[PDB]
């Protein structure tokens, strides 16, 4: 049946079906630390992609793929606040971190402009919204749908819980071009949701790579960006 | 792998793998009308269950099942308002509509009391909250998590859209006992979400039947309760 | 995606999603004994509780399906009767009046009536010409279409008390039905394929399951299925 | 649920999730020609692997994976006979064609010795058994289970049909270490089967790449080695 379906209940150090870029890696406890967690802390940018590209749309038949993904993640800050955030994304097949990318752009963008050549769709869990540094951001931690730009086309207030596990379910229904983000914290019932219209055929190439990215722009306001598990399915 | 998984992209008149109770039926256009839609309007109560019971928990091993379900539905009211609502539920294997049930109880309850003998867990999409007849309801249309009672243990404001298709994803994660309801309207981006803790092993018997139920208590304030598609998976 | 997909790694006593007919039941050890184990003559069938749409009359589409199961046939002596079968019958079908162990509770007679609407894969242990004149001269795997007299058979190298793994696939576009049997204990393998048009034999809605029989208490054997996987898609 | 599951109903020219080695490629008609079809004909060796490695066993837990795969293929010879054959295999992650490999070794082996360092398990559909060049082969076209050597640990007569489509189902049940090969020709009912005991944990590394390989050692006895579709699943 379905074109593709994979599931990681846990990660293993030096997992061969995951492409690690930047500081991303998996600890001995089995968690994907997309951002570096080290004794003397430090600035960091990392991305982790599934090793095989996925056909998101077909130019022959014109068909677009519907997909669903689920993952659990933890963002633990030392103080009461941290930077910069985590993102789930779709980019051109075997994409590399752009030259001159920063933590605030999650290793996804070279700048704050909206270039159609970026060919990136991402769901961000943005923890830093400082106005002189991230002027494009709203005045609160948020969940945003990014389409070719770090300046989200739509955002929603994210009630982040320090050190608590968040369960996320993202669905893309091709026939209606609807992208829905479902987030909940089992520990206390906190839930956030956001949906937006996005035509994948219009933004991305036929073959894409999916994964996570994140960054810590200021070592003094450190936080982790750990993903505990990951499920993904797609079908044309 | 997984214990059970079924998918209905559409329904067919007199579908043999669906048990119809009350006024529930599937039209020639392939939609499950859990509530009766007729030239001259009338009061109605209906339920539709998947024909085979599902083991939600094992008494031998003590294991509890995790499940996920997705469905799209439409509630179209003649005037600007309608009654009474729709519900997705889990009940004892091959459960029948209780004697003396009403539209306001969605054919799930005999009364407004919280009896542990009911053994019912349901997610309701309640359109009628009139304090004269439904005193247990909040002052707005809502999504509620019902556990052995029509008086929800938790509700959230439901931004119902007249005649628009709503996509719903319900997930139950056994290890954390977390039940999450994710609703969105692709037509305009409206999204509602709610999460609650529920121990299935404590409320339901080992074998249950899953399905939809609904009711129209006042023909003068008529509305449809149509489910367009349905996906379901469970695993112990 | 796929219309239906279920999996039983083990069975549980009085499983609610299985319809038991005749002497079929599940033991406390979690195995489906389609035939009664205790001794006496027996006939039993076990069906999945929900019907399955095998073909659509609107679109004309036919469903492709795959199933996998493991079973054991343990005889007391060096031989036993009568066999086990995997089948597709009309939705919520009952055991026919006057059925016998040699017909696995699937047929009223040895005639080929199109009204039977039955397709079955049999693992036939008894081929005595006295009671089963339609059978070949050896234990076999047969593809039955509306009759106990198989349209095609193949020698079955049955192993007493050993677990057999079976994979049955039906590829609708080519109308091909393949039966794949193997004994992990010693490598013994048997295979058979035949052309069958489901749309021509069965109604839109069918019930799937197992059936079996022990026609002679003196030549007793079990007909136990240990696990079961099934998928179908239109 | 399941670790991995992919399905190709057809192939597309320059498919990004398939690694092509040697002469392997996919035609405009959507078929994977692991061997070159040029006419002007020529000698050829080709391999096609799924782009992402698969974890076949875990050294931490000791668990071994069970897997199932299905594919349809055609071997069309110009004359009444052709060479050399096709193979489905599991090799070390991102394995390359060995230096000095030949068509009779399907681009899998450097020699006819049984080296444990080869770390290869393959199911071959061998069309050439000439004792002059393939002395290790039996006296008929066959299906063989290869474990670290081109000299099969077990074979069975293969009733090859020129130009007809063959459906193959290969299952590996970890608990019993049983590998079963199920082949059938829908056109005439011809069926062949073979099973053998193989401990994956003992032969292969934790991470492996799966795919097809084939060869045409003599351009004068040309034949195609086309795979039409491919399904694969694995679970630890
Ligand atoms: C932005 O990133 C792209 C990709 O690496 C690169 O080609 C471009 O030069 C970058 N812009 C700058 C100013 O570095
Ligand atoms: C309420 O429902 C229960 C279950 O069907 C039934 O036993 C009880 O008698 C009902 N109450 C009335 C008044 O019928
Ligand atoms: C054979 O079985 C069918 C179905 O139960 C029944 O209608 C028929 O009368 C049976 N024949 C006899 C002789 O009982
Ligand atoms: C055989 O293949 C291996 C792998 O490429 C290589 O290391 C070796 O040198 C080759 N030749 C011989 C003679 O083994
Ligand atoms: Ca930011
Ligand atoms: Ca109400
Ligand atoms: Ca017989
Ligand atoms: Ca050879
Ligand atoms: Mn932002
Ligand atoms: Mn309510
Ligand atoms: Mn027979
Ligand atoms: Mn050989």
DSSP states along C142-205? EEEESSSS-SEEEE----TT--EEEEEEEEGGGTEEEEEEE-TTT--EEEEEEE--HHHHS-SE
Q: How far is CA A170 from the centre of its chain?
A: 11
First to last CA, chain B: 10
Q: Which residues on neighbouring strands pair with residue C33, listed in sequence order?
A: C25, C224
A110: left (phi over 0), alpha (psi -120 to 50) or beta: alpha
How many interchain CB pairs under 8 A, B with D? Answer: 6
CB-CB contact of A229 with A71 (8 Å): yes
| Burial class of residue D99 in the structure, from the number of CB atoms within 10 Å of its CB (0-12 exposed, 13-18 middle, 19+ buried) | exposed
What single string gives the DSSP state of each residue in D176-208?
A: GTEEEEEEE-TTT--EEEEEEE--HHHHS-SEE
CATH code of A210's domain: 2.60.120.200
Q: Which residues of C touch B60 (CB under 8 A)?
A: 12
CB contact under 8 A, D193 and C195: no
Q: SS3 for C217?
A: helix
Residues C67, C168: contact at Cβ < 8 Å?
yes
Distance to chain C for A91, nearest Cα, Å: 25
How many Å apart are CA C203 and CA B173, to the nearest integer?
39
- Give the residue among A69, A110, A112 at the shortest CA–CA distance from A89: A69
Number of CB atoms found within 10 A of residue D213's CB: 30
Are A192 and A156 spatial neighbours (Cβ–Cβ below 8 Å)?
yes
Q: Are A167 and A189 in contact (CB under 8 A)?
A: no
How many residues in chain D? Answer: 236
- Nearest CA-CA distance, residue C193 and chain D, Å: 5
Contact present, D53 and D64 (Cβ < 8 Å): no
Q: Is C96 in the pocket of ligand 3 (CB under 6 A)?
A: yes
The residues facing B180 across adjacent strands are B171, B195
Neighbours of chain B (3+ CB pairs under 8 A): A, C, D
Residue B72: name the closest of D79, A212, A173 by CA.
A173
Chain Cα centroid distance, residue C217: 21
Q: Is A194 on the interface with B (CB under 8 A)?
A: yes
Breaks in chain C after residues, C-to-N cutoff 2.5 Å: 38
State the maximum Cα–Cα separation within chain D, in Å, rounded to a whole number: 53
Contacts of D176 in chain C (CB under 8 A): 165, 184
Question: What are D136's strand-pairing partners?
Answer: none
Q: Report how far ligand 4's centroid is from the alpha carbon of D117 (Å).
A: 11
Q: Best interface-test mutation with C: which of B16, B28, B58 has the largest number of C CBs within 10 A?
A: B16
- Calpha distance C192→C177 (Å, rounded): 8
> Which residues are B77's β-sheet partners?
B223
CA-CA-CA-CA torsion sign (B111, B114, B116, B120): positive
Residue B201's SS3 state is helix
* Phi-psi label, residue C207: left if phi above 0, alpha if psi -120 to 50, beta otherwise: beta
How many angstroms separate the Cα of D57 from the Cα of each of A18, A29, D50, D64? 17, 18, 18, 4
- Round to whole Å and give the CA distance between B111 and B100: 8
**B115: Cα separation from own chain's centroid:** 19
Q: Is any atom of ligand 1 closer than 6 Å to the C-beta of A100?
A: yes
Cα-Cα end-to-end distance for chain A: 10
DSSP C82-106: -EEEEEEEETT--PPTT--GGGTTT
**In chain B, beta strands by DSSP E:** 4-8, 18-22, 25-26, 32-33, 44-50, 54-55, 66-74, 85-92, 121-126, 142-147, 154-157, 166-173, 178-184, 191-197, 207-216, 226-235
Q: Give the Cα separation of D23 and A63 in Å (integer).
A: 30
Report the alpha-carbon distance of residue A3 to residue D202 in Å, rounded: 31
Q: Give residue D85's region: left, alpha or beta (phi > 0; psi -120 to 50).
A: left
Q: How far apart are CA D217 and CA B210, in angstroms?
A: 60
Closest CA to B49 of B155, B122, B114: B122
Residue A76's Cβ-count burial label (10 Å; 0-12, 13-18, 19+) is: middle
Contact D178 C165 (CB under 8 A): yes
Residue B85: CB partners within 8 Å, gap ≥ 6?
A: B75, B106, B124, B125, B126, B127, B128, B214, B215, B225
**How far is it, in rounded angstroms, from Cα D217 to Cα D137?**
15
Cβ atoms A145, A181 nearer than 8 A: yes
Give kind and range of the element (H or E) at residue C225. Answer: strand C224-233
Asked if D36 and D222 count as a contact pair (C-beta separation under 8 A), the reply is no
For ligand 2, atom 9, the nearest C-alpha belongs to B99
CA–chain centroid gap for B124, Å, is: 5
Q: What is the DSSP string of B116-153?
A: TTS--EEEEEE----TTT-TTS-SS-EEEEEESSSS-S
Q: Which helix (H) or strand (E) segment is B200 a member of?
A: helix B200-203
| CB of B99 sitting under 6 A from ligand 2 | yes
CA distance A180 to C156: 54
User: At B202, which helix (H) or strand (E)?
Assistant: helix B200-203
User: Which chain B residue shows the shortest CA-CA distance from C90?
Assistant: B16
Contact C191 D189 (CB under 8 A): no
Residue B221 per-residue DSSP state: G
Calculated CA dihedral for residues B50, B51, B57, B58, nearest 10 degrees: -160
Geometric angle at alpha carbon A144, from A168 and A17, rounded to 5°: 50
What are D126-130's contacts with CB under 8 Å, separation 24+?
A: D126/D84, D126/D85, D126/D158, D127/D75, D127/D77, D127/D81, D127/D82, D127/D83, D127/D84, D127/D85, D127/D160, D127/D223, D128/D82, D128/D83, D128/D84, D128/D85, D128/D104, D128/D217, D128/D221
- What resolution in Å is listed for this PDB structure? 2.3
Ramachandran sector of residue A203 (left: φ over 0; alpha: ψ -120 to 50; beta: rest)? alpha
Helix (H, G, I), strand (E, B) or coil at D37: coil
CA angle C158, C159, C163 (to 5 degrees): 110
How many CB atoms lie under 10 A from the CB of residue B79?
A: 10
Tell me whether residue C110 is exposed, middle or buried, using C-beta atoms within 10 angstroms of its C-beta: 0 to 12, 13 to 18, 19 or more: middle
Q: Is the peptide bond before A39 cis (omega within 30 degrees of 0)?
A: no
Atom number, ligand 1, closest to the C-alpha of residue A96: 5
Q: What does the alpha-carbon distance between residue D74 and residue B158 come to, in Å, rounded to a whole number?
A: 57
Distance CA C10, CA B59 (A): 14
Q: CA-to-CA distance for A233 and A213, rounded, in angstroms?
A: 19
CA distance A150 to A144: 9
Instruction: Give the side-chain half-sphere CA count within 13 A for A51.
Output: 20
Q: Which atom of ligand 4 is nearest to the CA of D97?
A: 5
User: In Å, how far are C29, D33, D137 from D225, measured between CA atoms?
Assistant: 48, 6, 19
Angle at B217 between CA B214 and CA B219, to 5 degrees: 110
Kind plus residue range of the DSSP H or E element containing B203: helix B200-203
**HSE of B28 in the Cβ direction (CA atoms, 13 Å)?**
0
Q: List b or e across A113-148, with b for residues whose CB sees 16 or more CB atoms inside 10 angstroms.
A: eeeeebbbbbbbbbbbbeeeebeebeeebbbbbbbb
Q: For residue B10, which of C127, C59, C104 has the smallest C-alpha distance? A: C59
A180 CB neighbours in chain B (<8 A) are 167, 169, 182, 184, 191
Q: Do C169 and D191 touch, CB atoms closer than 8 A? A: no
B1 touches chain D (CB under 8 A): yes
Q: Other CB atoms closer than 10 Å to residue A159's CB: what's the count?
A: 16
Q: Other CB atoms closer than 10 Å to residue A23's CB: what's the count?
A: 21
Tell me how far CA of residue B109 lies from CA of B89, B201, C43, in angstroms: 12, 20, 42
- In whole angstroms, how far apart are CA B232 and each of A102, B10, B35, B68, B216? 42, 14, 21, 6, 26
HSE-up of residue B101 (Cα within 13 Å, Cβ side): 23
Q: Which atom of ligand 3 is nearest to the CA of C108?
A: 1
**Beta bridge partners of residue B30, listed in sequence order:** none
CA distance B152 to chain C (A): 29
Instruction: Reduce the secondary structure of chain A to three states and give it as a string.
Output: CCCEEEEECCCCCCCCCEEEEECCEECCCCCEECCCCCCCCCCEEEEEEECCCEECECCCCCCECEEEEEEEEECCECCCCCCCEEEEEEEECCCCCCCCCCHHHCCCCCCCCCCCCCCCEEEEEECCCCCCCCCCCCCCCEEEEEECCCCCCEEEECCCCCCCEEEEEEEEEHHHCEEEEEEECCCCCCEEEEEEECCHHHHCCCEEEEEEEEEECCHHHCECCEEEEEEEEEEC
Distant-in-sequence, close-in-space partners of D178: CB < 8 Å, separation ≥ 6 = C165, C182, C184, D171, D172, D195, D196, D197
Q: Which residues share a beta bridge with D233?
A: D5, D68
Q: Would you say the CB of residue A92 lies under 6 angstroms from ligand 1?
A: no
Q: Which of A12, A14, A48, A52 to mutate to test the interface with D (most CBs of D within 10 A)?
A: A52
- The answer to whether the CB atoms of C50 and B54 lie below 8 A apart is no
In short, whether A110's Cβ falls inside 6 Å of ligand 1 is yes
CB < 8 Å to C2, chain B: 5, 7
Query: Which ligand is in closest contact with the Cα of C125?
Result: 7
CB of D117 closer than 6 A to ligand 4? no
End-to-end Cα, chain D, rounded Å: 10
Evaluate whether B195 touches B78 at the Cβ level (below 8 Å).
no
3-state secondary structure of B219: helix
In terms of Cα–Cα distance, which of A53, A55, A17 is closest to A235?
A55
Cα dist from D210 to A234, C48, D204, whole Å: 21, 35, 12
Q: How many residues in total does chain A contain?
A: 236
Interatomic CA distance for residues A15 and B217, integer angstroms: 58
- Beta-carbon separation of B169 and A169 below 8 A: yes
Give the separation between CA D225 and CA D77, rounded to whole angstroms.
9
Neighbours of B34 (CB within 10 A): 31
Name the burial class of residue C195, with classes exposed (0-12), middle (13-18) and buried (19+) by CB atoms within 10 angstroms of its CB.
middle
> What SS3 class is residue C218?
helix
**Residue A61 CB–ligand 1 contact under 6 Å:** no
Least Cα distance to A223 among A51, A16, A31, A34 occurs for: A34
Q: Are C142 and C121 in contact (CB under 8 A)?
A: yes
Which letter, b or e, does each residue of B128-152 get, where b requires 16 or more Cβ atoms within 10 Å of its Cβ?
bbeeeebeebeeebbbbbbbbbbbb
Range of the domain at D96: 1-236
Q: Number of structural domains, chain A?
A: 1
Tell me the three state secondary structure of residue B99: coil
In terms of Cβ atoms closer than 10 Å to its own Cβ (0-12, 13-18, 19+), residue C35 is: buried
CA distance A166 to A181: 12
Dihedrals phi, psi of C225, to nearest 5 degrees: -105, 125
Contact pairs from chain A to chain B, CB under 8 Å: 68
Q: Tell the burial category of A222 from Cβ atoms under 10 Å away from its Cβ (0-12, 13-18, 19+).
A: buried
Asked if D81 contacts D221 with a C-beta cutoff of 8 angstroms, the reply is yes
Cα A62 to its chain centre, rounded Å, is 27
B186/chain A closest Cα distance in angstroms: 6
Q: Find chain A residues with C-beta within 8 A of C233's C-beta.
A: 1
Ordered DSSP codes for D141-183: -EEEEEESSSS-SEEEE----TT--EEEEEEEEGGGTEEEEEE
DSSP, res D103: G
D189 and C CB contact within 8 Å: yes
CB-hemisphere CA count at 13 Å for D148?
Answer: 14
Experimental technique used? X-ray
**E strands, chain D, in order:** 4-8, 18-22, 25-26, 32-33, 44-50, 54-55, 66-74, 85-92, 121-126, 142-147, 154-157, 166-173, 178-184, 191-197, 207-216, 226-235
Say how far apart CA B110 and CA C163 lie, in whole Å. Answer: 51
CB C215 within 8 A of CB C39: no
**What SS3 class is residue B104?**
helix
Q: List Cα–Cα distances, D25 to B232, D37, D70, D95, D234, in angstroms.
A: 39, 10, 20, 17, 25
CA distance B214 to A94: 49
Q: Alpha-carbon distance D44 to D216, whole Å?
A: 5
| Closest Cα in chain A, distance from residue B192 (Å) | 7
- DSSP per position, C12-55: -TT-TTEEEEET-EE-TTS-EESS------EEEEEEESS-EE-B
3-state class of B162 per DSSP?
Answer: coil
Which residue from C minimizes the CA distance to D180? C182
* Cα–Cα distance for residue pair C213/C210, rounded to 1 Å: 11
Chain C residues closer than 8 Å to D184 by CB: 176, 178, 191, 193
The verdict on a CB contact (< 8 Å) between C17 and B55 is yes
Closest chain C C-alpha to D220 CA, distance in angstroms: 33
Is residue D235 within 8 angstroms of chain B, CB to CB? Answer: yes
């Amino acid at each position: 049946s379905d074109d593709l379906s994979f599931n990681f209940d846990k990660f293993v150090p030096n997992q061969k079906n995951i492409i690690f870029q930047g500081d991303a890696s998996v600890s001995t406890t089995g968690v994907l630390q997309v951002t570096k967690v080290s004794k003397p802390t430090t600035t960091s940018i990392g991305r982790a992609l599934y090793a095989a590209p996925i056909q998101i749309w077909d130019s022959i038949t014109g068909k677009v793929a519907s997909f669903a993904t689920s993952f659990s993640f933890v963002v633990k800050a030392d103080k009461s606040d941290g930077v910069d955030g985590l993102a789930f994304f779709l980019a051109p097949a075997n994409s590399q971190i752009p030259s001159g990318s920063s933590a605030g752009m999650f290793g996804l963008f070279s700048s704050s402009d909206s270039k159609s050549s970026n060919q990136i769709i991402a769901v961000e869990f943005d923890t830093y919204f400082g106005k002189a540094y991230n002027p494009w951001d709203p005045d609160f931690k948020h969940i945003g749908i990014d389409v070719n730009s770090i300046k989200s086309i739509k955002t929603v207030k994210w009630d982040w819980r320090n050190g608590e596990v968040a369960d996320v379910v993202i669905t893309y229904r091709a026939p209606t071009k609807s992208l829905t983000v479902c987030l909940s914290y089992p520990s206390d019932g906190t839930s956030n949701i956001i949906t937006a219209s996005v035509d994948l055929k219009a933004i991305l190439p036929e073959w894409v790579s999916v994964g996570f990215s994140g960054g810590v722009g200021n070592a003094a306001e450190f936080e982790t960006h750990d993903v505990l598990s990951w499920y993904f399915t797609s079908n044309l």
